[PDB]
């Protein structure tokens, strides 16, 4: 019941012959998978910690200029020289100047002066790469027990840490058995082309090549005294005051400029180690050693009384909180959805098996009814509690929402979205293969095209398809226009 009020829960119904249902654990999301007889349980990856990462290189965002020194030679003589030109910490630019008898030189013409300056950085910005032998994913597995304090609670579950070295694991549950994960973390979010960069207690994940491309003076990265800065001319600016003499100016603080240069990069907490949020992981659930643990129990004769008003979630599932009345046994909770004058039931129990645990705490069930007027009967006797509800939506709206959600999943996760709820069907493999090929082509073509430029190119290609004599219109327009407009509309995230 940890995966109840999140608003991004997406149910995974059904499992294969070998019972290895699959899910793709999205960082903000949670799955709430279930089965025909297994205990329904919800899974959500939470933190994906990384640690013992090394510093690769250091960039400089604020500079100080000291010891400005200048020399000038007469015209028709070599470029002016300082003994300070060849020091590692000096930026020095030759230039020209006019001088004649007014400057004490006999021969008129353009002379050469140079202004060397010592450059020392004040606040570097480090870019630290993360390795693969230290990445540690952390997954909570909270099982729907209908416990008193399980709805919305974020501190209930059994941690199953999964590192790339020890990919597989088996999370032992309190009383429901064992659930095994064969998760594959190497195919998830790529941590090879992603380099962390940190400034002033802020850490971001940026593409590695982009981090090298950006124009700031860098250094070796290994910590030491006086890191000899390379490409340091980007900060120092050498203004020439209309050919009479030269001035040296330091550009200023680049913190704000970088805070704009990182517009599309995700952010991660950097308080202790690196709690890298904003990831995604795929995994398959063995889900064959689990036990319902409630089948042997009986059915409670005594009545049931609720404690909170019925309130459904954003996904149209009734949630019921009911406390058992006086009796001397734990049991199964009977349950049957009924219409006002129709006894056909179409409402399932998303909770596996509602069982009273300690006789004193309310056990809160969570079950979805069919859309329309349909009351709920819980107790076995004729004095049973009869909670009545009228579901608002319709099946067509649910289908539309499902299509939109699947479109979002395929637009975000890309190639691996076809394996989300995969039962192992052959058709899903073919779909994933063709989507992988088309997605590779699309990424190659559209890599780096911005949010507005995608929409522009999409509408342009849609018009080109529409006004075409050849029978490539029905392909180009539909496919490229729809795909590109959708990706432009939902690309920024």
């Amino acid at each position, epitope marked *: 019941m940890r995966c109840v009020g999140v608003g991004n829960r997406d149910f995974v119904e059904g499992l294969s012959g070998a019972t290895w249902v699959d899910v793709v654990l999205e960082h903000g999301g949670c799955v709430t998978t279930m089965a025909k007889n297994k205990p329904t349980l919800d899974i959500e990856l939470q933190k994906t910690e990384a640690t013992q990462l090394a510093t690769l290189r250091k960039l400089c965002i604020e500079g*100080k*200029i*000291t*010891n*400005i*020194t*200048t020399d000038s030679r007469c015209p028709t003589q070599g470029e002016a020289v300082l003994p300070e030109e060849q020091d590692q910490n000096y930026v020095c630019k030759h230039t020209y100047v006019d001088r004649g008898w007014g400057n004490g030189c006999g021969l008129f013409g353009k002379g050469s002066l140079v202004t060397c300056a010592k450059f020392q950085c*004040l606040e570097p910005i480090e870019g630290k790469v993360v390795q693969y032998e230290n990445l540690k994913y952390t997954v909570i597995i909270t099982v729907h027990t209908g416990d008193q304090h399980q709805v919305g609670n974020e501190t209930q579950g059994v941690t199953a840490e999964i590192t790339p070295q020890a990919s597989t694991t088996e999370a032992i549950l309190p009383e429901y058995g064992t659930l095994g994960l064969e998760c594959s973390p190497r195919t998830g979010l790529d941590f090879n082309e992603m380099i962390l960069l940190t400034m002033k207690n802020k850490a971001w994940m940026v593409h590695r090549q982009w981090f090298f491309d950006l124009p700031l003076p860098w250094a070796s990265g290994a910590t030491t*005294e*006086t890191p000899t800065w390379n490409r340091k001319e980007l900060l120092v600016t050498f203004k020439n005051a209309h050919a009479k003499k030269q001035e040296v100016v330091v550009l200023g603080s680049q913190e704000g400029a970088m805070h704009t240069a990182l517009t599309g990069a995700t952010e991660i907490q950097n308080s202790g180690g690196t709690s890298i949020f904003a990831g995604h992981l795929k995994c398959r659930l063995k889900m064959d050693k689990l036990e319902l643990k409630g089948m042997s129990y009986a059915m409670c004769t005594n009545t049931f009384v609720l404690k909170k008003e019925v309130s459904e979630t954003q996904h149209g599932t009734i949630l019921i909180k009911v406390e058992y009345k006086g009796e001397d046994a734990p049991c199964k909770i009977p349950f049957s959805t009924e219409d006002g004058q129709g006894k056909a039931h179409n409402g399932r129990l998303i909770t596996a098996n509602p069982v009273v645990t300690k006789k004193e705490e309310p056990v809160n069930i969570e079950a979805e009814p069919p859309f329309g007027e349909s009351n709920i009967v819980i107790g076995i006797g004729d004095n049973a509690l009869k909670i009545n509800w009228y579901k608002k939506g319709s099946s067509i709206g649910k289908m539309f929402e499902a299509t939109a959600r699947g479109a979002r999943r395929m637009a975000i996760l890309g190639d691996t979205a076809w394996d989300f709820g995969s039962v192992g069907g052959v058709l899903n493999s073919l779909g994933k293969m063709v989507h992988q090929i088309f997605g590779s082509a699309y990424t190659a073509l559209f890599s780096g095209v911005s949010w507005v430029m995608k929409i522009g190119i999409g509408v342009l290609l849609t018009w080109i398809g529409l006004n075409s004599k050849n029978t490539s219109m029905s392909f180009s327009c539909i496919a490229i226009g729809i795909i590109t407009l959708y990706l432009g509309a939902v690309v920024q995230a």
Partner: antibody
């Protein structure tokens, strides 16, 4: 946003040693050239010592030459001022100052610490 | 060592009036290589650690009210305070920064008349 805090000021008899620590925060401490400063009550500010960005360019004033030791530890973000052969004239409140972020001088004062007072008497 | 002399040792000005301080050096503070006069000015508020007002002479440090203005060149420099508030009481210290043994001037003071 810069924050400089002092520590080590206490009463002491003449001749005995004492070490003053300047803990700093809010900036990269290792890429700076810290100073020390002092002022006796009823008198003007008096310079004490400087340690450069490179740890091997220390300097001191004439009245305090050959009697004080200044040392930085980058990792612990503290500035150590080991003072020996202290006298009742040398007692004063000691200020720990930062370097000039914007400017041309390799040595200047942007920001002053809170200030600790060391009391010297018999 | 540079002898620093401040013309007033105590200024009593009524609010809304200008107060000017003259600090005359003993040798030239102009660094020949860059042609910049390296002078500094600090205000120590009552019972506070001093802050910085005028790095170099023309320039002015951030977080400083626009009223303060440095002037002068070649061993004789001058501040100006167009309007004096109750918060301008303190101990203005001119200091040279050209040569390594930094010497402050004797502390002047500014009290409201």
């Amino acid at each position: 946003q810069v924050e400089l805090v002092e520590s080590g000021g206490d009463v002491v008899q003449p001749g005995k040693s004492l070490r003053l620590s300047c803990a700093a925060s809010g900036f990269t401490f290792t890429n700076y050239a810290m100073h020390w400063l002092r002022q006796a009550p009823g008198k003007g500010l008096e310079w004490v010592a400087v340690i450069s960005s490179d740890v091997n360019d220390k300097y001191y004033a004439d009245s305090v030459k050959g009697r004080f030791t200044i040392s930085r530890d980058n990792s612990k973000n503290t500035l150590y001022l080991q003072m020996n052969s202290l006298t009742p004239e040398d007692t004063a409140v000691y200020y720990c100052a930062r370097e000039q972020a914007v400017g041309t001088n390799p040595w200047a004062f942007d920001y002053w610490g809170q200030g600790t007072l060391v009391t010297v008497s018999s | 060592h540079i002898v620093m002399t401040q013309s007033p040792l105590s200024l009593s000005v009524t609010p809304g009036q200008p107060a000017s301080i003259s600090c005359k050096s003993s040798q030239i503070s102009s660094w020949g290589s860059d042609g910049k006069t390296y002078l500094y000015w600090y205000l120590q508020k009552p019972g506070q650690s001093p802050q910085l007002l005028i790095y170099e002479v023309s320039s002015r440090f951030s977080g400083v009210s626009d009223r303060f203005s440095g002037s002068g060149s070649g061993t004789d420099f001058t501040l100006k305070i167009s309007r004096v508030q109750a918060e301008d009481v303190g101990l203005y210290y001119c200091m040279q920064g050209l040569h390594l043994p930094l010497t402050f001037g004797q502390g002047t003071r500014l009290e409201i008349k």
